[PDB]
Structure formats: structure tokens, C-alpha cells
Amino acid sequence: HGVWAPNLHYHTPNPEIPALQDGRLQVVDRPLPIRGGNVGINSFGFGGSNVHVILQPNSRPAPPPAQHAALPRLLQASGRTLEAVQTLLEQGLRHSRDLAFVGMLNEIAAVSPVAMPFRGYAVLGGEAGSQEVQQVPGSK
Amino acid sequence: MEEVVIAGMSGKLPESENLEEFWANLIGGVDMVTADDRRWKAGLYGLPRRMGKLKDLSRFDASFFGVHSKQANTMDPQLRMLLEVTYEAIVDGGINPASLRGTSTGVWVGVSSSDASEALSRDPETLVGYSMIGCQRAMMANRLSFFFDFKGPSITIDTACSSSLLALQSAYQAIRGGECSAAVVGGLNVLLKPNSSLQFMKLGMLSQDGTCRSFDAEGTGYCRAEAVVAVLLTKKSLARRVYATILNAGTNTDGSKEQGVTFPSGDVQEQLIRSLYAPA
Amino acid sequence: QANTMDPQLRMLLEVTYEAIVDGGINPASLRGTSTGVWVGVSSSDASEALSRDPETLVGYSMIGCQRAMMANRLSFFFDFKGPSITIDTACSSSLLALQSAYQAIRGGECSAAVVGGLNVLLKPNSSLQFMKLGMLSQDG
Amino acid sequence: SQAWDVPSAADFPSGSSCSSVAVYKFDVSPESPDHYLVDHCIDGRVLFPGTGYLWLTWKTLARALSQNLE
Amino acid sequence: SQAWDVPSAADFPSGSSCSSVAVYKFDVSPESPDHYLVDHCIDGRVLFPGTGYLWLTWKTLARALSQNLE
């Protein structure tokens, strides 16, 4: 979301460590937009076992193709109830033109109705607004 | 040799069932710690009225995971909602779980408190012997490996508070060097027996205030909270989605401090932070 | 603080001394090392025992029972500043600890390690569960 | 849909050897093995057999005794 | 030389919850917090205060009550 979670309960910087207003460190008490990501993380078990880990966010925006141009995509889904599916299709519709997202949804949907006995589909884009949800006969 | 990325994530956290709830609370700056008769009572034995508690804890989709209705009521709820989040996590990263069935994929779990286990082992002639296939710590991973068919390393680590992060370190390392193509990194903590907190409070590490005053001068202690969380690591040449890339990670261990065992050695923590930066 | 120590940990602290000096090394030579500790432990019975009577039982029993301490407190006394870790995998564990350390040494990380395995049979309920799964031999 | 057994804080002990207290739960729906009880109807109500309390208690005794009823 | 506390057979749960039975163990060696009891000497023996049983019992009550003595 390009923003750092506003830490809570921050009021009086601990008067036992500087850098809490000595410029060096900056407690995030406000929602700060993020710029040049690259993060560390701490975890110290009370028994004296420490571990750190460095991260590098991926930075990469979405191109402008010519396929979802006039081409409606097919979005399909599976779940454990009518809702489980009605939920997914709701998220697919609200993110119509986003191809990265729809593709993934699809790669997932492919689960045997032996486990996910509930399926549905939607026609993203195109004057269809064609959307059907059904239960699914077991067996092959 | 190979590049390691965070492809999937999910969890259930204090006053949040899914990660979109969790976020609305992080942004909305909402205190997820509460004052409830939820795990135990108003303020039993003087324990602080505040705890970070999971909304529900009894929920679980037992048929889908293939567990006899009986053999499920004798399952540690951590494991219950682990089996769910780590599914919710794999599919989070655009991968159909089944694609991994039979893989050299592995499972690392950070778990320190198996409370449910003791609870269902008292009754000496009320006691169902297969509760242990559903509570014995090893199962926090062994049974996650079981259902997803991950034929790679299945392991639980305990290092107190560290653990889950060190699990995430341990897996990254396994992938990095051949062994695996992906991993399930999980962390679990559920607060069921009050005696536990009671020990903590007697060591003073428990905040009566019932809060984690993060850097504010009035830091008494911390405020225990629960969560099941899991992430999917994988090699980039296999991730349909990448939240971030792991650049490094390692752990050491506060030597022998003169000031006791509980004392966080910042001089050692300092070392650990260097080992992973500047020259190396 | 000793009567509230899990006897595993008690006799671990002794064997792993008895072990280091077994190999002609004076333990102290390792003080401050990047040496590490891996423990295969599945059953911390003593831990629950001293955690019931909430007026009787004291708060620092957990510095002497909490699984993490099976290694964290072995690391503590010997001054091993390298990885301190407990693993649980049921019966496997201790061997897999010995695997895990070998690997850490192999590739830089450490110059030496303490591999430990611990199992003490205190609560009968445990065995009772096993028997009900049939894996216990009546023949004994 | 279905909600499952979450070991409550109550479950855990304040300490005990407790072999001398027993709670018995009685289901009278036609499926229950203790459906036979519905035949102790009196004046139109199904009242637990005064005799039953003796049985319960008696059972309870042998429990604490590591023995069986017989 | 010195032998230490080995959690015993009968130390872990052995029936089910009972907010209604309590065992109290009393050590009178000079280290114990309950050493104060050695001052209830009578005729040359150290006899547990008749009054003590009342205290024990009283404690026990409040336990079962989820409450504290006060």
C-alpha cells in the first residue's frame, strides 16, 4: 500500500536511548508514504536467541497492453460454499481490467470438485455481464 | 546460489480473521488488544485485563481437510487454523496447492506453546489416544506436510519469541542451497492456560498496564497476544507473485551475560546485525 | 531456581560438559565462540508439573522448563554465541539435530556444535495415549 | 458452519489428584443409551429415578477405588 | 551429594477438573516459607495449628470461588 503502519502508544520518547529525536531514528507515529524500500526485521527470544533478516521489496508497475483492450476475459472460481465463490467473483468484477490478478484467480480455481464442490464464472468486460454460480456433481 | 522470495502470506491475528481485517486495523490505528472474558476471566489471579485475542478459535473446515469428526475435536486449534491459513497462503500467491503435491517442498513451524495438548491428556479414562496425532508439537508441521503432500523437510522449532522468524530463516536457507523449491513458514501461538501468563508476570516481563508501549518511556512490560500466520517462500523462477526478496538472514545467541539469562544482550544483537550487512 | 529446573536440562548441562571434555578440549577454550547448540527434545513433562498450583509454583520455573531453554540455557552457561535451537519431530529429532549442526559447520557458520537428545518419562498419561494408538508394546 | 471443541481456561487445573468427584451428563433423546430413562415417567414428567442417584453414587465409589461396580 | 526435586508420578492431572479439592504440602525445614510453623511447638512436638486447618479450608473455599481470601 506504499505506506508504513502507524505505530501506536508513541508519546514520550524513552529518555534512556537517544536518536529518538536525535535525528538518527524516526518512530513511525503517522502514516508515512514509503519511497525507497529495503527493510530489516528483528526477533529475539527471551532465552537469548536472536535472528535478523533483510528484505528487498519488488518495485514494478503494470504495463499498458492491447489485449484487455476490446477483449473480455473469462474469470472462473471454486470454493466450499455459494458464498466462497460469490465472494471471489465479487473481487474479480471489482478488478476487471487487472490481468495479473485475474490470471492468478484462475490458476487457483483448478481444484477437483471432490474438495471444492462449488464453482462459478464471470465475463469481465463486454456487454455480457454474464455470471453464473452453481453446485457441481461429484464423481468424474 | 538461487534467489528466494516471499510469494504467499496469510494469518489470523487479534481482532482480525483474515489479513484484510488485520490491515484495516494497522492503518486505522486500532488497538487490537482487548478486555475480555474470552480466553479466561476478567482478571484472574491479577493478570492484566488485556490480551491480543483471535476473534474465533473454534472454527475449522474439517471435511475438506479430511478429519473424522471425533479426531478433529481432539485437534489443537493452532493446527486447525494453521492447516487453513497455509492453504489460504499458498493460493494467496496464485499457485494451486495441488501443483505442489509430491514436491520436495518443506514445512517449518515456529511454535512455542502447545497448551491444547496438555488439556486433552489429563482424563485418564476419558482420554482418546489419537489426540496426540493432533497435539504433539511435531504435528504442527508433520500434519501440515501430511495433507499438502510436501515430501520435503517437516520441522518445528522452539526458541521462545524468536522461532517463527528463525523458521523463516531456516527455510530460506534450505531453498537457497538446492534442497527445496518452496516452503511453508508458519508461526503459531494460542493463549489458553492462564498459569502460563502467571509465570510470566512473576518474572515481571508482563505489563500490568496490559500494553506494548513500544518506545514510550513508561515501558512496564509486554502484553501477550496470539496468532497463526504463514508465508510461502519459493525460488523466483517459480513465484507467480513476489511481495519481497530475501537478501540475507542469520542468527546468533547472547553469550553468557552477567546480568542473568533473561537480559537482552544488545552488544550481541549488535553483532548479529553486522554479520548480515556492510562487508558481508 | 534449581528445584524448579527440568531434570532433562539438569543432566543435559552435565553430559554436554562431560562430552566436550570427552574430546580432549577444555570447555573454556570455546567460551565466546561462534559455536552452536542443537537439541532434539520432544517431551517437556517437568514443565507442566511445575505450572499448575498458581500460588505454589514460582515464576522462574519457566527459565528452567520452557523448551527453548534446553538449548538457550546450554548456550548460556558455556558461552556459545552461535545458534541455539531446539527441534521437535517426534522420534527423529536428535538425529535431525545432529544433521542440522553438521550442515551448519560444513558451510562456514560454526567451528563446532553441541548436539543433544533428551527424553524423560514422567507423566503416565503420555504412555496411556501411546497405548491407545497401539504403538506401545504390552509385552514391554 | 460447525464450531468445535476449544479447551477452555476452566479445563486446566488449580491443582489436584481428584479421583473423587464425577460429573455425569444425561441425554434422553431417543438415540441416547440413557433413553431407557424416559420410562421413569411420573405424573407426566420424566423424573430421574430416585434410585438412579444411588447408582450414580455407587459407580462413583468404585471409580475412586480403581475398581469396577461388580 | 544433594538430591533434587524430581516431579513425581502422582504430580500431573489424574481425573478431571475439580474446583473443589486441594492438597497442601508443608515443609518445615528452616528454608521453607512455612517454617514459621515450628513455633507452634506443644509439649515438645511441632503440631500443626488446629487453627491452621481452618485457614487451609478457608483458602480452599475461595479457590473454588475463583476469588482470593480477602
XYZ file of C-alpha atoms in Angstrom:
700
model
C 0.000 0.000 0.000
C 3.084 2.225 -0.224
C 2.781 3.325 3.385
C 4.106 2.401 6.800
C 1.705 1.284 9.526
C 1.429 3.998 12.195
C 2.914 2.517 15.349
C 0.726 3.057 18.449
C 1.152 4.358 22.000
C 4.087 6.547 20.985
C 4.197 9.634 23.177
C 7.315 10.286 25.265
C 10.498 9.009 23.560
C 12.386 6.799 26.030
C 14.906 9.015 27.856
C 17.382 6.128 28.021
C 18.198 5.971 24.284
C 18.963 8.980 22.080
C 18.226 9.087 18.349
C 14.537 9.124 19.316
C 14.663 12.826 18.391
C 18.410 12.889 17.850
C 17.615 12.624 14.138
C 19.027 9.141 13.577
C 15.877 7.039 14.150
C 12.258 8.033 13.448
C 9.388 6.311 15.183
C 6.501 5.955 12.742
C 3.609 7.553 14.667
C 1.949 8.817 11.477
C 1.023 7.145 8.186
C 4.185 7.854 6.175
C 4.223 7.217 2.407
C 7.135 4.915 1.507
C 9.756 5.779 -1.101
C 12.943 3.716 -1.418
C 12.186 0.366 0.206
C 14.735 -2.002 1.740
C 13.927 -3.400 5.163
C 15.322 -5.276 8.154
C 13.452 -7.293 10.783
C 14.199 -8.394 14.378
C 13.182 -11.281 16.619
C 14.765 -12.063 19.956
C 13.617 -14.979 22.092
C 13.777 -14.269 25.814
C 16.303 -17.096 26.183
C 18.827 -15.072 24.226
C 18.346 -16.317 20.699
C 18.364 -13.544 18.182
C 17.744 -13.529 14.459
C 17.670 -10.808 11.803
C 16.549 -10.815 8.171
C 16.986 -8.268 5.373
C 14.358 -7.721 2.691
C 14.185 -6.082 -0.706
C 10.693 -5.150 -1.834
C 9.979 -5.607 -5.505
C 9.240 -2.355 -7.297
C 7.474 -2.752 -10.632
C 4.359 -1.085 -12.167
C 1.834 -2.548 -14.622
C 2.365 -2.056 -18.410
C -0.346 -0.865 -20.901
C -1.293 -3.807 -23.243
C -3.808 -4.001 -26.136
C -5.471 -7.318 -25.243
C -7.928 -6.432 -22.462
C -8.406 -3.607 -24.965
C -11.607 -4.889 -26.562
C -11.127 -8.467 -25.336
C -13.273 -9.556 -22.395
C -11.536 -12.163 -20.209
C -13.039 -15.196 -18.516
C -12.894 -15.366 -14.732
C -13.601 -18.676 -13.041
C -13.519 -19.748 -9.410
C -14.096 -22.515 -6.875
C -14.820 -22.746 -3.151
C -16.607 -24.528 -0.303
C -19.962 -22.697 -0.440
C -22.137 -20.498 -2.621
C -20.595 -17.591 -0.746
C -16.970 -18.715 -1.116
C -17.468 -18.261 -4.863
C -19.826 -15.267 -4.848
C -17.015 -13.644 -2.851
C -14.292 -14.332 -5.394
C -16.349 -13.247 -8.395
C -17.098 -10.023 -6.470
C -13.354 -9.371 -6.229
C -12.829 -10.281 -9.881
C -15.512 -7.895 -11.067
C -14.201 -5.022 -8.933
C -10.766 -5.548 -10.505
C -11.941 -6.131 -14.080
C -9.137 -4.774 -16.229
C -6.356 -6.024 -13.873
C -4.871 -9.023 -15.708
C -2.245 -10.019 -13.163
C -4.961 -10.591 -10.592
C -7.474 -12.428 -12.765
C -4.898 -14.811 -14.159
C -3.953 -15.916 -10.667
C -7.589 -16.334 -9.532
C -7.883 -18.733 -12.433
C -4.746 -20.727 -11.790
C -6.290 -21.362 -8.387
C -9.803 -22.288 -9.440
C -8.456 -25.554 -10.874
C -9.253 -27.801 -7.891
C -11.152 -31.072 -8.123
C -14.844 -30.700 -7.125
C -14.049 -33.611 -4.818
C -12.755 -30.876 -2.490
C -14.270 -27.688 -3.881
C -17.841 -28.686 -4.884
C -18.767 -25.110 -5.677
C -17.919 -23.224 -8.829
C -18.818 -20.076 -10.720
C -17.760 -17.765 -13.515
C -17.990 -14.168 -14.755
C -17.374 -12.464 -18.110
C -15.149 -9.465 -17.293
C -15.685 -6.596 -19.720
C -18.022 -6.868 -22.708
C -21.750 -6.037 -22.564
C -22.362 -9.591 -21.322
C -22.386 -9.052 -17.565
C -22.747 -12.849 -17.820
C -22.320 -14.504 -14.407
C -23.433 -17.944 -13.223
C -22.889 -19.784 -9.919
C -23.710 -23.494 -9.463
C -23.070 -26.593 -7.391
C -21.139 -29.366 -9.048
C -21.856 -33.095 -9.484
C -19.146 -35.152 -7.792
C -17.509 -38.138 -9.490
C -15.599 -37.865 -12.756
C 23.129 -19.835 -5.246
C 19.393 -19.450 -6.017
C 17.083 -16.479 -5.353
C 14.439 -16.656 -2.604
C 11.157 -14.724 -2.482
C 8.036 -14.334 -0.397
C 5.245 -15.496 -2.683
C 2.391 -16.140 -0.289
C 1.112 -14.858 3.038
C -1.860 -15.279 5.355
C -2.807 -15.320 9.006
C -5.379 -14.794 11.719
C -4.472 -12.055 14.205
C -6.014 -10.232 17.224
C -9.492 -8.986 16.297
C -8.838 -9.913 12.672
C -9.839 -13.150 10.890
C -8.068 -12.512 7.585
C -5.241 -10.248 6.505
C -7.546 -7.553 5.112
C -9.097 -7.115 8.555
C -5.607 -7.053 10.121
C -4.644 -4.206 7.771
C -7.731 -2.048 8.274
C -6.639 -2.135 11.921
C -2.976 -1.334 11.308
C -3.870 1.659 9.146
C -6.931 2.719 11.117
C -4.619 2.683 14.115
C -6.924 0.426 16.088
C -5.788 -1.272 19.276
C -6.299 -4.963 18.651
C -5.743 -5.692 22.333
C -8.996 -6.022 24.323
C -10.554 -6.513 27.761
C -12.436 -9.792 27.512
C -13.736 -12.790 29.409
C -12.634 -14.532 26.213
C -9.718 -16.878 26.907
C -10.196 -16.778 30.629
C -11.680 -14.407 33.089
C -11.877 -10.645 33.741
C -8.545 -10.559 35.585
C -7.808 -13.975 37.057
C -5.051 -14.019 39.701
C -4.280 -10.364 38.959
C -3.210 -10.964 35.360
C -3.667 -7.844 33.203
C -7.129 -7.441 31.747
C -5.613 -7.014 28.288
C -4.773 -9.630 25.611
C -4.489 -9.731 21.835
C -7.092 -12.424 21.140
C -8.213 -14.180 17.936
C -11.817 -13.423 17.051
C -12.900 -17.065 16.806
C -10.830 -20.137 17.622
C -13.330 -22.972 17.306
C -13.872 -22.596 13.579
C -12.381 -25.107 11.157
C -13.500 -26.816 7.949
C -12.933 -30.426 8.993
C -14.320 -32.310 5.991
C -12.159 -30.515 3.473
C -9.034 -31.472 5.408
C -10.338 -34.989 5.790
C -10.564 -35.441 9.553
C -13.030 -37.691 11.316
C -15.422 -35.509 13.309
C -14.117 -37.131 16.510
C -10.428 -36.953 15.604
C -10.988 -33.213 14.995
C -12.358 -32.235 18.386
C -9.134 -33.663 19.671
C -7.099 -31.310 17.457
C -5.098 -28.395 18.841
C -6.824 -25.320 17.384
C -3.424 -23.902 16.323
C -3.053 -26.855 13.967
C -6.652 -26.445 12.897
C -6.241 -22.863 11.735
C -2.685 -23.498 10.574
C -3.985 -26.062 8.069
C -6.275 -23.308 6.859
C -4.001 -20.290 6.736
C -1.244 -22.167 4.923
C -3.785 -23.138 2.307
C -5.056 -19.533 2.327
C -1.418 -18.600 1.915
C -0.390 -20.851 -0.946
C -3.360 -19.887 -3.025
C -2.599 -16.326 -1.960
C 0.353 -16.438 -4.333
C -1.557 -17.620 -7.377
C -0.438 -21.222 -7.059
C -2.844 -24.085 -6.954
C -1.791 -26.133 -3.920
C -2.158 -29.367 -5.848
C 0.632 -28.303 -8.217
C 2.939 -28.876 -5.237
C 1.639 -32.330 -4.308
C 4.604 -34.707 -4.212
C 7.173 -31.912 -4.244
C 10.480 -31.690 -2.476
C 8.743 -28.808 -0.706
C 9.103 -28.339 3.048
C 7.470 -27.057 6.195
C 8.948 -25.049 9.044
C 6.889 -24.057 12.025
C 7.645 -21.629 14.819
C 5.719 -22.882 17.800
C 6.406 -22.362 21.497
C 3.129 -23.069 23.288
C 1.164 -26.293 22.782
C -1.480 -25.697 25.508
C -4.350 -27.650 23.951
C -2.125 -30.673 24.171
C -1.957 -30.854 27.944
C -5.657 -30.036 28.273
C -6.697 -33.232 26.447
C -4.308 -35.612 28.234
C -5.480 -35.364 31.837
C -8.644 -37.528 31.690
C -7.009 -40.859 32.373
C -10.048 -42.942 31.393
C -11.895 -40.304 29.335
C -8.970 -39.871 27.015
C -8.866 -40.586 23.310
C -5.418 -41.843 22.278
C -5.454 -40.108 18.898
C -5.414 -36.643 20.379
C -1.673 -36.963 20.224
C -1.767 -37.239 16.432
C -3.410 -33.833 16.800
C -1.414 -32.098 19.507
C 2.133 -33.464 19.782
C 4.235 -30.466 18.655
C 5.839 -32.377 15.824
C 2.378 -32.477 14.190
C 2.304 -28.674 13.775
C 4.394 -29.386 10.700
C 4.238 -33.167 10.210
C 0.458 -32.872 9.714
C 0.733 -29.860 7.507
C 3.242 -31.809 5.427
C 0.837 -34.734 5.519
C -2.233 -33.082 3.953
C -0.455 -30.956 1.343
C 1.797 -33.860 0.367
C 5.039 -31.946 0.912
C 7.696 -34.663 0.858
C 10.467 -32.238 1.897
C 11.644 -31.408 5.466
C 8.906 -31.131 8.046
C 10.042 -29.378 11.183
C 9.029 -27.453 14.293
C 11.385 -25.066 16.036
C 11.176 -23.595 19.525
C 13.341 -20.664 20.573
C 10.786 -18.684 22.501
C 9.767 -15.398 20.893
C 12.277 -15.815 18.011
C 11.253 -19.111 16.369
C 8.855 -18.154 13.589
C 11.338 -15.675 12.215
C 14.078 -18.258 12.622
C 11.822 -20.732 10.858
C 11.569 -18.235 8.010
C 15.350 -18.041 8.102
C 15.780 -21.803 8.189
C 13.590 -22.317 5.106
C 15.115 -19.513 3.066
C 18.425 -21.286 3.649
C 17.108 -24.675 2.582
C 15.723 -23.236 -0.677
C 18.802 -21.118 -1.331
C 21.034 -24.170 -1.438
C 19.151 -26.679 -3.562
C 17.158 -28.780 -1.079
C 13.741 -27.202 -1.798
C 11.820 -25.335 -4.468
C 9.461 -23.792 -1.930
C 8.480 -23.786 1.751
C 5.748 -23.240 4.302
C 6.878 -20.944 7.072
C 4.458 -20.802 9.936
C 4.136 -19.216 13.339
C 1.617 -20.202 15.996
C 0.749 -19.055 19.476
C -2.553 -19.588 21.286
C -3.227 -18.423 24.855
C -5.299 -20.998 26.663
C -3.896 -21.711 30.121
C -3.635 -18.736 32.457
C -0.929 -20.389 34.513
C 1.421 -19.550 31.610
C 0.800 -15.792 31.881
C 1.053 -16.135 35.645
C 4.632 -17.409 35.324
C 5.469 -14.549 33.008
C 4.052 -11.955 35.399
C 6.115 -13.364 38.283
C 9.197 -12.772 36.117
C 7.962 -9.228 35.666
C 8.046 -9.347 31.894
C 4.238 -8.994 31.918
C 2.871 -5.465 31.612
C 0.163 -4.805 34.216
C -0.856 -1.842 32.077
C -1.622 -4.595 29.561
C 0.089 -2.989 26.573
C 3.265 -2.917 24.477
C 4.309 0.682 24.938
C 6.699 0.306 22.019
C 9.269 3.044 22.726
C 7.448 5.273 25.197
C 9.320 5.993 28.438
C 6.654 4.281 30.572
C 7.518 0.797 29.329
C 6.468 -1.651 32.042
C 6.489 -4.882 30.065
C 4.804 -6.535 27.092
C 1.262 -7.722 26.529
C 0.903 -11.258 25.234
C -1.236 -11.799 22.138
C -1.975 -14.788 19.888
C -1.741 -15.522 16.160
C -1.472 -18.150 13.460
C 0.414 -16.824 10.487
C 2.074 -18.382 7.494
C 4.033 -17.426 4.421
C 5.092 -19.204 1.268
C 8.720 -18.933 0.178
C 9.860 -20.098 -3.243
C 12.530 -19.599 -5.874
C 11.797 -16.580 -8.115
C 11.792 -18.821 -11.175
C 8.577 -20.264 -9.787
C 6.739 -17.450 -7.988
C 3.629 -16.060 -9.657
C 3.728 -13.230 -7.166
C 6.525 -11.640 -5.116
C 5.946 -9.487 -2.024
C 9.658 -9.129 -1.481
C 13.022 -10.858 -1.858
C 15.170 -12.160 0.988
C 18.650 -10.618 0.784
C 20.078 -12.216 3.931
C 19.394 -13.698 7.369
C 21.215 -15.383 10.238
C 21.028 -15.856 13.987
C 23.343 -15.887 16.947
C 22.871 -16.248 20.676
C 23.518 -13.747 23.528
C 26.551 -15.423 25.079
C 26.619 -15.690 28.844
C 25.561 -12.344 30.247
C 26.439 -11.442 33.827
C 23.056 -9.848 34.333
C 21.073 -13.095 34.028
C 19.547 -15.197 31.271
C 16.526 -13.016 30.585
C 18.698 -9.965 29.883
C 18.674 -8.978 26.192
C 22.311 -8.536 25.178
C 22.320 -5.582 22.819
C 26.052 -5.961 22.401
C 25.424 -9.390 20.877
C 22.342 -8.308 18.921
C 24.554 -5.601 17.523
C 26.962 -8.230 16.238
C 24.184 -10.246 14.567
C 23.032 -7.143 12.710
C 26.534 -6.523 11.309
C 27.161 -10.088 10.177
C 24.486 -9.546 7.593
C 25.408 -6.114 6.255
C 28.385 -3.886 5.365
C 31.236 -6.204 4.292
C 29.036 -9.332 4.181
C 15.961 -21.782 40.917
C 17.344 -25.328 40.575
C 14.477 -27.254 42.143
C 12.394 -25.577 39.520
C 14.616 -26.961 36.722
C 13.503 -29.701 34.331
C 15.770 -32.666 35.113
C 16.470 -33.139 31.396
C 18.118 -29.721 31.379
C 19.885 -30.518 34.618
C 21.590 -33.619 33.274
C 21.950 -32.093 29.810
C 24.142 -29.328 31.300
C 26.217 -32.120 32.771
C 26.514 -34.540 29.852
C 27.415 -31.845 27.340
C 30.207 -30.800 29.681
C 31.122 -34.487 30.122
C 31.027 -34.596 26.358
C 33.163 -31.632 25.444
C 35.913 -32.669 27.806
C 35.421 -36.152 26.453
C 37.129 -34.963 23.306
C 40.219 -33.517 24.976
C 39.031 -29.929 24.742
C 38.819 -27.667 27.729
C 35.291 -26.185 27.561
C 36.608 -22.741 28.355
C 38.571 -22.715 25.101
C 35.179 -22.399 23.425
C 33.891 -19.504 25.560
C 32.805 -16.712 23.220
C 32.933 -18.890 20.132
C 30.641 -18.895 17.121
C 29.802 -22.373 18.433
C 26.186 -23.575 18.458
C 23.696 -25.829 20.167
C 21.054 -28.128 18.704
C 18.727 -30.107 20.888
C 16.353 -32.901 19.980
C 13.608 -32.737 22.545
C 10.015 -33.943 22.258
C 8.729 -34.269 25.846
C 8.968 -31.419 28.400
C 6.900 -33.083 31.157
C 8.588 -31.394 34.126
C 7.419 -28.127 32.589
C 3.709 -28.757 33.079
C 4.145 -30.337 36.525
C 5.510 -27.063 37.974
C 2.898 -24.896 36.282
C -0.372 -25.878 37.994
C -0.686 -24.541 41.592
C -0.962 -20.817 40.813
C 0.045 -19.815 44.310
C 2.534 -22.596 44.910
C 4.596 -22.610 41.795
C 7.075 -19.789 41.136
C 7.671 -17.641 38.064
C 11.270 -18.574 37.259
C 10.487 -22.215 36.687
C 9.913 -21.150 33.105
C 13.545 -20.090 32.760
C 14.133 -23.743 33.639
C 11.475 -25.615 31.693
C 10.330 -23.713 28.611
C 11.605 -25.947 25.760
C 13.691 -23.181 24.234
C 15.867 -23.368 27.374
C 17.005 -26.909 26.531
C 19.447 -25.161 24.261
C 19.253 -21.472 25.200
C 20.477 -22.334 28.715
C 23.122 -24.693 27.486
C 24.311 -21.909 25.211
C 24.086 -19.598 28.197
C 26.446 -21.384 30.595
C 29.061 -22.499 28.059
C 29.066 -19.076 26.377
C 28.299 -20.440 22.899
C 27.383 -17.314 20.914
C 26.324 -19.333 17.850
C 22.854 -20.728 17.002
C 20.896 -22.065 19.950
C 17.990 -24.240 18.866
C 15.533 -26.957 19.874
C 13.895 -29.173 17.316
C 10.835 -31.406 17.663
C 9.990 -34.065 15.062
C 8.948 -36.863 17.352
C 11.305 -39.811 17.383
C 13.590 -38.320 14.660
C 14.697 -35.006 16.176
C 18.003 -35.755 17.922
C 19.352 -37.357 14.769
C 17.987 -34.452 12.751
C 19.598 -32.112 15.229
C 22.898 -33.900 14.543
C 22.148 -33.404 10.861
C 21.285 -29.770 11.291
C 24.557 -28.972 13.107
C 26.807 -30.895 10.715
C 25.315 -28.755 7.972
C 25.922 -25.516 9.868
C 29.595 -26.420 10.447
C 30.057 -27.745 6.919
C 29.228 -24.374 5.398
C 31.095 -21.813 7.491
C 28.673 -20.748 10.224
C 30.285 -22.742 13.073
C 33.542 -24.306 14.134
C 31.808 -26.739 16.476
C 28.432 -27.767 17.916
C 26.560 -29.394 20.781
C 24.130 -31.979 19.538
C 21.812 -33.208 22.226
C 18.882 -35.552 22.643
C 16.575 -35.671 25.655
C 13.591 -37.697 26.735
C 12.346 -38.247 30.283
C 9.213 -40.247 31.157
C 7.373 -38.561 33.965
C 3.653 -38.402 33.247
C 1.904 -41.708 32.667
C -0.876 -40.086 30.686
C 1.661 -39.780 27.837
C 2.236 -43.554 27.660
C -1.511 -44.048 28.000
C -2.086 -42.074 24.789
C 0.550 -44.157 23.003
C -1.016 -47.417 24.144
C -4.429 -46.318 22.845
C -2.806 -45.844 19.433
C -1.468 -49.358 19.844
C 2.172 -48.370 19.281
C 3.109 -49.391 22.805
C 4.086 -52.992 23.363
C 2.179 -54.718 26.166
C 4.992 -57.270 26.206
C 7.036 -54.222 27.201
C -20.687 -23.586 9.950
C -19.808 -26.152 12.617
C -17.972 -24.885 15.713
C -15.534 -27.187 17.503
C -14.017 -28.023 20.886
C -11.688 -25.284 22.149
C -10.247 -26.434 25.515
C -11.438 -23.682 27.868
C -9.366 -21.930 30.511
C -11.681 -23.614 33.007
C -10.467 -27.025 31.869
C -6.957 -26.563 33.273
C -6.283 -27.154 36.986
C -5.881 -25.257 40.195
C -4.116 -28.496 41.191
C -5.499 -31.902 42.176
C -5.308 -35.679 42.398
C -9.149 -35.580 42.106
C -10.365 -39.149 41.649
C -13.302 -38.488 43.976
C -15.563 -36.138 42.024
C -17.561 -37.110 38.934
C -19.972 -35.278 36.666
C -22.448 -37.368 34.706
C -24.335 -35.962 31.728
C -27.631 -37.475 30.717
C -29.197 -37.353 27.278
C -32.791 -38.569 26.939
C -33.353 -38.060 23.188
C -34.315 -41.461 21.677
C -30.789 -42.001 20.323
C -29.079 -41.918 23.732
C -28.208 -45.177 25.574
C -29.788 -43.443 28.551
C -33.093 -43.209 26.683
C -34.298 -46.063 28.849
C -34.839 -43.347 31.432
C -37.888 -41.909 29.685
C -39.732 -44.863 31.121
C -39.444 -43.363 34.509
C -42.417 -41.125 33.819
C -44.300 -39.793 36.862
C -47.472 -37.709 36.686
C -46.486 -36.763 33.154
C -42.894 -35.655 33.773
C -39.789 -37.775 33.219
C -38.111 -37.664 36.618
C -34.659 -39.081 37.225
C -35.125 -42.255 39.313
C -34.537 -41.568 42.992
C -32.851 -44.936 42.706
C -30.607 -43.608 39.985
C -28.776 -41.226 42.345
C -27.780 -44.285 44.325
C -26.425 -45.886 41.186
C -24.505 -42.817 40.121
C -23.050 -42.504 43.627
C -22.232 -46.187 43.663
C -20.449 -46.055 40.332
C -18.583 -43.005 41.669
C -17.434 -45.038 44.668
C -15.805 -47.777 42.631
C -14.181 -45.197 40.351
C -12.336 -43.654 43.335
C -11.495 -47.261 44.270
C -9.825 -48.100 40.959
C -12.401 -50.930 40.883
C -15.494 -51.781 38.804
C -19.086 -51.943 40.038
C -19.228 -55.730 40.304
C 25.697 -35.132 47.138
C 22.458 -33.153 47.175
C 19.373 -34.783 45.589
C 16.753 -32.557 43.942
C 13.072 -32.280 43.092
C 12.029 -34.918 40.633
C 8.416 -34.294 39.631
C 6.603 -37.425 40.794
C 4.244 -39.991 39.331
C 1.203 -38.501 41.043
C 2.093 -34.884 40.121
C 0.149 -34.456 36.864
C -3.634 -34.351 36.238
C -5.342 -37.673 37.127
C -9.140 -37.448 36.670
C -10.512 -34.072 35.501
C -11.122 -30.521 36.812
C -12.339 -30.074 40.398
C -12.612 -26.552 41.713
C -13.283 -28.352 44.993
C -10.368 -30.442 46.207
C -6.929 -29.213 47.226
C -3.824 -30.871 48.588
C -1.391 -28.725 50.539
C 2.154 -29.881 51.234
C 4.028 -28.463 54.185
C 7.785 -28.265 54.581
C 9.149 -27.255 57.988
C 12.910 -27.300 57.300
C 14.321 -23.793 58.076
C 14.360 -22.833 54.414
C 10.620 -23.251 53.856
C 8.284 -20.213 53.965
C 6.146 -22.422 56.201
C 8.995 -22.643 58.707
C 7.051 -20.198 60.833
C 5.080 -23.271 61.849
C 7.873 -24.644 64.010
C 6.802 -22.060 66.530
C 3.661 -23.955 67.192
C 5.503 -26.313 69.489
C 3.398 -28.199 72.071
C 4.806 -30.453 74.775
C 7.904 -30.844 72.646
C 6.315 -31.743 69.318
C 5.586 -29.357 66.467
C 1.844 -29.807 65.943
C 0.017 -28.231 63.042
C -2.129 -25.392 64.466
C -5.712 -26.506 64.984
C -6.311 -23.036 63.681
C -4.347 -23.838 60.564
C -6.931 -26.373 59.319
C -9.413 -23.539 59.338
C -7.060 -21.447 57.246
C -6.376 -24.208 54.765
C -10.106 -24.864 54.482
C -10.785 -21.180 54.095
C -8.235 -20.758 51.327
C -9.782 -23.814 49.641
C -13.180 -22.118 49.725
C -12.083 -19.032 47.889
C -10.195 -21.174 45.377
C -13.412 -22.940 44.398
C -14.931 -19.442 44.273
C -12.475 -18.059 41.740
C -11.845 -15.441 44.474
C -8.989 -14.535 46.840
C -9.027 -14.811 50.624
C -9.595 -11.096 51.254
